[PDB]
Design an enzyme around this catalytic site. Structure first.
Site, mmCIF file in Angstrom:
data_model
loop_
_atom_site.group_PDB
_atom_site.id
_atom_site.type_symbol
_atom_site.label_atom_id
_atom_site.label_comp_id
_atom_site.label_asym_id
_atom_site.label_seq_id
_atom_site.Cartn_x
_atom_site.Cartn_y
_atom_site.Cartn_z
ATOM 1 N N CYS B 155 0.771 -1.224 0.024
ATOM 2 C CA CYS B 155 -0.060 0.128 0.100
ATOM 3 C C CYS B 155 1.053 1.332 -0.157
ATOM 4 C CB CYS B 155 -0.796 -0.024 1.213
ATOM 5 S SG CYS B 155 -0.048 0.039 2.775
ATOM 6 N N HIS B 182 2.888 5.977 8.682
ATOM 7 C CA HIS B 182 2.389 4.554 8.786
ATOM 8 C C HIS B 182 1.740 4.456 10.028
ATOM 9 C CE1 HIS B 182 1.934 0.704 6.969
ATOM 10 N NE2 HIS B 182 2.049 0.279 8.445
HETATM 11 N N1 LIG Z 1 -4.586 -4.241 5.221
HETATM 12 C C1 LIG Z 1 -3.794 -3.547 4.154
HETATM 13 O O1 LIG Z 1 -4.465 -3.205 3.213
HETATM 14 C C2 LIG Z 1 -2.247 -3.756 4.154
HETATM 15 C C3 LIG Z 1 -1.662 -2.872 3.213
HETATM 16 C C4 LIG Z 1 -0.332 -3.376 2.845
HETATM 17 C C5 LIG Z 1 0.061 -4.436 3.752
HETATM 18 N N2 LIG Z 1 -0.433 -4.905 4.777
HETATM 19 C C6 LIG Z 1 0.461 -5.742 5.737
HETATM 20 O O2 LIG Z 1 0.122 -7.126 5.482
HETATM 21 C C7 LIG Z 1 -0.319 -8.064 6.250
HETATM 22 C C8 LIG Z 1 -1.548 -8.490 6.096
HETATM 23 O O3 LIG Z 1 -2.422 -7.507 5.703
HETATM 24 P P1 LIG Z 1 -3.523 -6.862 7.182
HETATM 25 O O4 LIG Z 1 -3.328 -5.396 7.365
HETATM 26 O O5 LIG Z 1 -5.071 -7.366 6.639
HETATM 27 O O6 LIG Z 1 -2.956 -7.866 8.431
HETATM 28 P P2 LIG Z 1 -3.536 -9.178 9.032
HETATM 29 O O7 LIG Z 1 -2.758 -9.262 10.324
HETATM 30 O O8 LIG Z 1 -5.153 -9.002 9.445
HETATM 31 O O9 LIG Z 1 -3.259 -10.337 8.166
HETATM 32 C C9 LIG Z 1 -2.698 -11.422 8.703
HETATM 33 C C10 LIG Z 1 -4.278 -12.187 8.729
HETATM 34 O O10 LIG Z 1 -4.044 -13.631 8.160
HETATM 35 C C11 LIG Z 1 -4.264 -14.651 9.151
HETATM 36 N N3 LIG Z 1 -3.512 -15.702 8.657
HETATM 37 C C12 LIG Z 1 -2.010 -15.806 8.786
HETATM 38 N N4 LIG Z 1 -1.633 -17.076 8.542
HETATM 39 C C13 LIG Z 1 -2.569 -17.797 8.198
HETATM 40 C C14 LIG Z 1 -2.714 -19.079 7.495
HETATM 41 N N5 LIG Z 1 -1.603 -20.140 7.424
HETATM 42 N N6 LIG Z 1 -4.101 -19.665 7.165
HETATM 43 C C15 LIG Z 1 -4.879 -18.846 7.271
HETATM 44 N N7 LIG Z 1 -4.759 -17.382 7.884
HETATM 45 C C16 LIG Z 1 -3.873 -16.921 8.079
HETATM 46 C C17 LIG Z 1 -4.178 -14.094 10.545
HETATM 47 O O11 LIG Z 1 -4.720 -14.728 11.463
HETATM 48 C C18 LIG Z 1 -4.413 -12.620 10.124
HETATM 49 O O12 LIG Z 1 -5.965 -12.579 10.421
HETATM 50 C C19 LIG Z 1 -0.199 -7.151 7.562
HETATM 51 O O13 LIG Z 1 1.243 -7.232 8.214
HETATM 52 C C20 LIG Z 1 -0.410 -5.563 7.025
HETATM 53 O O14 LIG Z 1 0.379 -4.655 7.794
HETATM 54 C C21 LIG Z 1 -1.738 -4.728 4.777
#
Ligand SMILES: NC(=O)c1ccc[n+]([C@@H]2O[C@H](COP(=O)([O-])OP(=O)(O)OC[C@H]3O[C@@H](n4cnc5c(N)ncnc54)[C@H](O)[C@@H]3O)[C@@H](O)[C@H]2O)c1
Ligand SMILES: NC(=O)c1ccc[n+]([C@@H]2O[C@H](COP(=O)([O-])OP(=O)(O)OC[C@H]3O[C@@H](n4cnc5c(N)ncnc54)[C@H](O)[C@@H]3O)[C@@H](O)[C@H]2O)c1
Ligand SMILES: NC(=O)c1ccc[n+]([C@@H]2O[C@H](COP(=O)([O-])OP(=O)(O)OC[C@H]3O[C@@H](n4cnc5c(N)ncnc54)[C@H](O)[C@@H]3O)[C@@H](O)[C@H]2O)c1
Ligand SMILES: NC(=O)c1ccc[n+]([C@@H]2O[C@H](COP(=O)([O-])OP(=O)(O)OC[C@H]3O[C@@H](n4cnc5c(N)ncnc54)[C@H](O)[C@@H]3O)[C@@H](O)[C@H]2O)c1
Ligand SMILES: NC(=O)c1ccc[n+]([C@@H]2O[C@H](COP(=O)([O-])OP(=O)(O)OC[C@H]3O[C@@H](n4cnc5c(N)ncnc54)[C@H](O)[C@@H]3O)[C@@H](O)[C@H]2O)c1
Lengths: 337, 368, 368, 368, 337
Positions: B155, B182
């Site tokens: 993002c 951020h």
């Molecule tokens: N949300 C966004 O738009 C965005 C933008 C850029 C980067 N990110 C980054 O990317 C990551 C994911 O995005 P997010 O913000 O939604 O974070 P998030 O922490 O919600 O994503 C991880 C999710 O995936 C699940 N998960 C992990 N391993 C799994 C597996 N093996 N099987 C099933 N489910 C599993 C976790 O339980 C958790 O709910 C984070 O570290 C975030 O900071 C997010």
């Protein structure tokens, strides 16, 4: 002098550690931790703290497992399997977990047979759990009893005086709740978890809940069961938390009467255990405070001499550790075996 | 339309769905998400957002695993393995990484193995193999038969990209850097607990994150001209969701005012990036940028030049909307193209398709 | 040793007092506090702090008026007009401006008129003559009893001081641009409500604000060597006291690394900016620089050499307590060379040196 | 010894191999290739080159897929799909590309997700994010754990960059062009046929195939120091295997003669490009450079300068052999930078391997 | 038609505005405000909210004092003195003490003196105030009354249902306490103030206090007086707040009986006014929900069926003005003059 090991280098770890060093003339040969946490990483996590700032001391994990702090090395390894942990390597005296997963009796054993002897966990464990806390049930500690835990800070907080209240005034019934700080119990954001609330982000909200405290009261107490119960609120604090309570007490009175009772109770037994004041204060005003909590006697209003709202902070982290050290000391001292 | 799902379930996936749902003309058939928590945990969480709150629809949890949105019946698988994921079992071609852990094509491949065709990454995946993607910037580069296993950058990246592409190619950077606002993000340990590092461990509730990102390098990952010339950490800071940036850079242009850039931005806003990104002039603050439909939202005032070269450019974004808004469009650009290919009819490249099929044609191999 | 008031309870002065009381042998005879709240309100914060917490010792609240800090009798007052400040009465020596408003010379001078000697405020120069003043950079210049109306500019400004003197002097910058993690500022309001302007008109409690700040000018108003060459914007952030700046700068000296500059910093930390400048080298987070002693502190890592000439560099500083130290510093900086001299030992047969008193002499008839 | 890999038995393959097997102590080797060749053929296909002729060691044809290279048991497979590549299924670490069809990290990560770490193509891919690599040029610039799959650009370029990456560096080109010969390669057409392309479609057997290539710019793709500073022409000439580039360059070095630069090249050959660049003295032609492990092969006398400013430089290079000699060694830097070299890196200070294993929960590197 | 005016265009203003705007079909002819806040600022305030987000509604400051909300102009000037405040310019129907400072009876009248008829103070009035609100006194209100008030959102929240609860059950004694946000009521940073607490920065703390709600019950609840009182906690939120309540009650039952009672209460009275459920959701999840307060039906645990801990949420901001908007139209209704 008591070889205690610390699995799960939870915030209490540095806390008790800083306590251990903050404590003077350690009865505790706590030369060993355990946590997945990086050796240096933990050291910094020790050497620096969101709560206390940096550790005003020496940090230099001696080799890897050991950690040179004020010359005192202290072991630690990154493992999760209890039996893997080198409890035997020092012939550990007491189990101290922080993973928050050993509510069981078994991991304790799975720690014990690995070379541990005593067992206490911070949180109120689940099952055949010997409730133990200063002023209340700590006296029950003998060396036969080994596999115990500790009450919650929250639990520890109310623990003595509410009994002392029921002692001093008699309690018909009572309802308490904390302003608890957010913890590892909640993923920063609302990510999947058992309790949706505990799952919930709430880093800017409250956790409507009820810790084992609202029952561990019965656990820690001989008779004070059911009649005395409330709920829990883990609320937007990073820091020392407060806890509410209204009691339906037996004896007819007015507030300060019981607050004087609180006062006179503060010195003798609650010495370093609790406190009570009336300077209008707020959360931070008790960081790293020795006793478990202070009481706003003024705001401990009373209704009809039975219904009695009460005020109580609590150093969720440090005073807990303080108490955890205290309990540890109580176990450290009178070390029969 | 095309069977869509989400490996794992990140915050994004919720709002993404909440977009995909709000999302009007979906050529995307979302039917299931790999939420390791069941229909309950997958219904509750996604229903009520830290920001968006309880959604304006129905979270009916069907079959203790499925879940419908006022009539959007959608399964919820629950498994931390890619291989046991109903992609082939449910014709899923386009998928969504939610774990963030599967920065590997393998995991996606495992999804491909599980019958997936297309997956995105909630990060710039460290597999350099798959070219990232970002709308308004390199989405046009997206064609067919290119990285079935698909990638997009962060993002943060996926925010700065277009104009930082635009402004340079309109102004000309030699090099320069950026930070941002951020947010505190679950990828950080909300309180001080080890994460192989101190930064994300420290209580984000009270500190900025001293940490280098990939945005300062994932930039050129879509705009080659930016090769290496960008660096300098963005900043993860105590924000709920807000993510606003400014970058200062040198110039090779004549050193115009800090005005005729937002102009170019207004141009970039108007012409190429209408709705794609945005630019404003009212002095606004973090939260106001909310569910913003623009990977980029920019002030004109805070723009500032000193000696022609140095040009700070305010910018904002939300991970969720942005990343959503991208994937809001990504799978479509996938859908409208890869499923239902319907290639051309120009014999000049007819065999080139068979070459696009088998480049080792009787005569296709070129320049070795 | 030298009479020291508190012109309204400056939270800066609070810790500065806490500094002073925590100080060793400060000639600053802290004697009274113009906190518009009485002894009660003017000790509660002096006993319990937001970021420090409860004081170590006890500031006992002696009479309804006038108190002590552990047997250190210190008066209190309650007023808002300098002319209504009985300071000559208390022989007050230095303006200890906590009201944070009288950036004007005269109203400040009125305190000198009230009996003070030299002005001191946490004030960026409203006018100009007020010597933009910081230790480490523009301190030795201070003329004994020369231009009594002085103060120090914003935290950020005096924060900027060392490096904005160092980097140039060690490297030579053509231009450059910083931006700092700016804690929310009490003068700026908590929520979205009535405000001077639009910028601070919101709840940066959960939002964030950059804005212009004379600092760049001020530090150039400190050091013309880069006058009108630097810019940037502090970043209002939900922090009690977090204050750490970046800096991007096109430099002149070849695109050398940072460590050199950091060893230059090492040397500079070794150098005159000792104690007010630190070279940070352990990866630490915002709060960690709690109660810190350095108007500047720079992490080894984030020091970045973008394009050689373009160089990115962080810098940490306690916006308040450090400044408070700095505040404690500049006073002592004057308190040493203070008017404790031999009281005009010079001699001149100049009837000027005679009518200097009796200026009303057409005999002399001062130039005017 | 590492589980190196090679995509298919491309006309470079055995060369690599026979040179790798000719190589004395490479830490690197593949145990299996994949192409519908048939080992007995493939052996012969390897064994008796049309240029290098019979190998000086018999590879036993253990069977249609396996074999033993003169006691070195190595397999092959027969498939065109990069998915079902038994790579981890034979522990493959890093691959070489033979088809040339994979200008894409997409096709590469396939091999990665087939169970490989990185891949290299003996061709300038169209993956910008993939940097080509060439000795004396970008080896130390190459970093493992960056841009997982890479390639090497044209042997031409692979030969080009060496001298120029010193030539301009000592001399300094204004903007000079290159011109190279080229031996008929399979991508061209031996007997005029129909590639979509017109040029590489006629009967190369006789006619020069004069064809353009990004080579004169792909150089910049790792030598931006001369970005745009060069564009030339490749000349596919009827040679079995041989190539030579004569690049003229306007030089800010007044009219410096050539031999001096060639002496600098004599220096450079005696310097950075040991075994890579050669500066010759003998009238020598196509075969007279055969199977030299040099890439850049130059004759000072055959070099010269027109106007002092512009100066041309003949540089010879085999297509196949040299490429191998270079790429074979180019592969090594990957093993020289091998991930931990599989030994002695993770003394529990990481606790991150498990964090790499327990990817999500102990969110060590949850980058975001 | 209700030519109502506000002075001190405080958050409730836009709230009321965004209410009034959102509250379509408005007999409320609010066309006149005043605040130290800048003219166009007041727009941005409404036009850009930290709570409701930037207003999803076209905004214009017209000429200047008048502000065309989606076109509906509304005058506003910058002043503080009631007699200066020219309510006479439109012979104002009702004053609303958005200022938060003229809790007095006079200045209210002085607004009427300077051109108005009726007064509802935003806050719990200063003494001689007929407080009126939904559930309790909105009916008891007659337009004959002129200078009235709405007590705290908290008060506005709590009153009816717990009163109805007493009507439903009979409450011997009662103790509530808000989880109030942090607000302009307190100093942002560690400033000076009447009370020490609000003077503290405390944006990361909690305020132990008591709002007039703890007493305005008696101010509004005829039976429910004195016996029913607790304290207030202004706690670390920027937003919608929750509130506890324990009640020593008469009716021997358990919460679920009272839950349905509180359920039917929404089905009879709290309809559009207050709310209750048990889906465990956090404060934010209650934002802008016009039902001014919510109850966790579950966690209202029962003690001896007399002592009754109860939960309670409330949209301190939105539902408040909503309820005030409600009463506003109730003032538009039966508008005798
Ligand atoms: N949300 C966004 O738009 C965005 C933008 C850029 C980067 N990110 C980054 O990317 C990551 C994911 O995005 P997010 O913000 O939604 O974070 P998030 O922490 O919600 O994503 C991880 C999710 O995936 C699940 N998960 C992990 N391993 C799994 C597996 N093996 N099987 C099933 N489910 C599993 C976790 O339980 C958790 O709910 C984070 O570290 C975030 O900071 C997010
Ligand atoms: N304060 C209270 O009264 C209260 C409230 C909530 C919970 N608790 C319980 O008490 C404790 C709270 O204090 P704390 O500091 O221990 O909590 P915490 O949040 O720090 O506990 C997690 C800690 O355990 C470590 N850990 C987790 N899994 C591990 C593994 N497999 N191997 C090694 N280390 C591992 C983590 O690194 C971290 O340091 C928890 O155990 C919790 O269950 C009590
Ligand atoms: N604290 C810093 O780091 C810093 C840095 C640069 C500038 N400043 C500015 O300088 C001010 C002082 O800094 P601070 O740390 O002491 O915060 P502060 O809260 O002490 O500043 C406000 C103080 O000014 C007093 N004030 C204003 N008008 C007054 C009046 N008529 N009568 C009596 N008192 C009056 C208030 O009582 C209050 O104590 C700040 O308010 C801020 O605006 C602060
Ligand atoms: N031989 C040279 O002189 C030279 C020069 C420059 C570059 N190259 C590299 O080699 C490529 C072609 O040259 P070459 O030396 O390899 O001759 P080549 O014709 O043998 O290379 C193509 C080989 O790959 C195999 N191939 C094609 N598609 C395949 C698939 N899906 N799966 C498995 N194998 C497949 C073919 O069998 C073929 O032998 C070039 O495109 C370039 O990548 C070679
Ligand atoms: N929503 C709630 O939680 C709640 C509860 C009870 C009462 N209230 C009322 O609303 C207020 C809380 O919201 P708020 O944002 O209005 O808080 P506030 O206390 O800051 O209200 C003051 C507002 O009116 C303006 N103002 C104050 N005095 C003025 C004067 N003399 N002249 C001109 N403008 C003046 C200020 O600029 C500001 O916008 C309370 O002060 C109270 O009156 C609200």
């Amino acid at each position: 002098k008591l070889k205690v090991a610390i699995n799960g280098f939870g915030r209490i770890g540095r806390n008790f550690l800083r306590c251990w060093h903050g404590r003077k003339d350690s009865p505790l040969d706590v030369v060993v931790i355990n946590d997945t946490g990086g050796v240096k990483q933990a050291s910094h996590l020790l050497k620096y703290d969101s709560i206390l700032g940096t550790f005003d001391a020496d940090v230099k994990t001696a080799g890897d497992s050991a950690i040179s702090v004020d010359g005192k090395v202290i072991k630690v390894v990154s493992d999760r399997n209890p039996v893997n942990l080198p409890w035997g390597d020092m012939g550990i005296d007491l189990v101290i977990e922080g993973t928050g997963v050993f509510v069981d009796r078994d991991g304790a054993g799975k720690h014990l047979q690995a070379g541990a002897k005593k067992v206490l966990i911070t949180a109120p464990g689940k099952g055949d759990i010997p409730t133990y806390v200063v002023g209340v049930n700590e006296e029950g500690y003998t060396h036969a009893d080994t596999i115990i835990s500790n009450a919650s800070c929250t639990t520890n907080c109310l623990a003595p005086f509410v009994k002392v209240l029921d002692q001093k005034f008699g309690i018909i019934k009572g309802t308490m709740t904390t302003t608890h700080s957010y913890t590892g119990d909640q993923r920063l954001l609302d990510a999947s978890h058992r309790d949706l609330r505990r799952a919930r982000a709430a880093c800017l909200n409250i956790v409507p809940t009820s810790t084992g405290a609202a029952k561990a009261v019965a656990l820690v107490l001989p008779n004070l069961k059911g009649k005395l119960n409330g709920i829990a609120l883990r609320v937007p604090t990073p820091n020392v938390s407060v806890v509410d309570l209204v009691v339906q007490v037996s004896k007819k009175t007015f507030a300060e009467e019981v607050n004087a009772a609180f006062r006179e109770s503060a010195d003798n037994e609650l010495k370093g255990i609790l406190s009570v004041c009336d300077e209008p204060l707020v959360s931070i005003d008790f960081r790293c405070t020795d006793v478990s909590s202070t009481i706003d006697s003024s705001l401990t209003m009373v209704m009809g001499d039975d219904m009695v709202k009460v005020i109580a902070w609590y150093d969720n982290e440090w005073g807990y550790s303080q108490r955890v050290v205290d309990l540890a000391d109580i176990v450290a001292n009178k070390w029969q075996x | 339309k095309l069977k869509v799902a989400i490996n794992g379930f990140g915050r994004i996936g919720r709002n993404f769905l909440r977009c995909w749902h709000g999302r009007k003309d979906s050529p995307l058939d979302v039917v299931v998400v790999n939420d390791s928590g069941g229909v309950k945990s997958a219904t509750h969480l996604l229903k009520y957002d830290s920001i968006l709150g309880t959604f304006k629809a129905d979270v009916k949890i069907i079959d203790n695993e499925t879940f419908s949105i006022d009539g959007k019946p959608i399964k919820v698988v629950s498994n931390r393995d890619p291989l046991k994921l109903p992609w082939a079992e449910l014709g899923i071609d386009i998928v969504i990484e939610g774990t963030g852990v599967f920065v590997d094509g393998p995991g996606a491949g495992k999804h491909i193995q599980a019958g997936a065709k297309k997956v995105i990454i909630t990060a710039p995946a460290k597999g350099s193999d798959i070219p990232t993607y970002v709308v308004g910037v390199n989405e046009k580069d997206y064609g067919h038969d290119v990285a079935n296993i698909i990638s997009n950058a962060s993002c943060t990246t996926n925010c700065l990209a277009p104009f930082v592409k635009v402004l340079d190619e309109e102004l000309g950077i030699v090099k320069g850097t950026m930070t941002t606002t951020h947010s505190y993000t679950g990828d950080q340990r909300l309180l001080d607990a080890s994460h192989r590092d101190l930064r994300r461990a420290r209580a984000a509730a009270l500190n900025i994150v001293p940490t280098s990102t990939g945005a300062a390098k994932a930039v050129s990952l879509v705009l080659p001209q930016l090769k290496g010339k960008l660096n300098g950490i963005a900043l993860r800071v105590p924000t709920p969701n807000v993510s606003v940036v400014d970058l200062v850079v040198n110039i090779e242009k004549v050193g115009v005012t800090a005005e005729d850039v937002n102009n170019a931005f207004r141009k970039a806003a108007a012409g190429p990036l209408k709705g794609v990104l945005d630019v404003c002039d009212i002095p606004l603050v973090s939260v106001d940028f909310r569910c913003s439909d623009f990977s980029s939202t920019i002030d004109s005032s805070l723009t500032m030049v000193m000696g022609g070269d140095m040009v700070k450019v305010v910018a904002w974004y939300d991970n969720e909307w942005g990343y959503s808004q991208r994937v809001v469009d990504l799978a479509d650009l996938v859908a409208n193209k890869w499923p239902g290919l319907e290639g051309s009819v120009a014999s000049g490249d007819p065999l080139e398709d068979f070459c696009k099929d088998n480049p080792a044609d009787e005569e296709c191999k070129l320049y070795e």
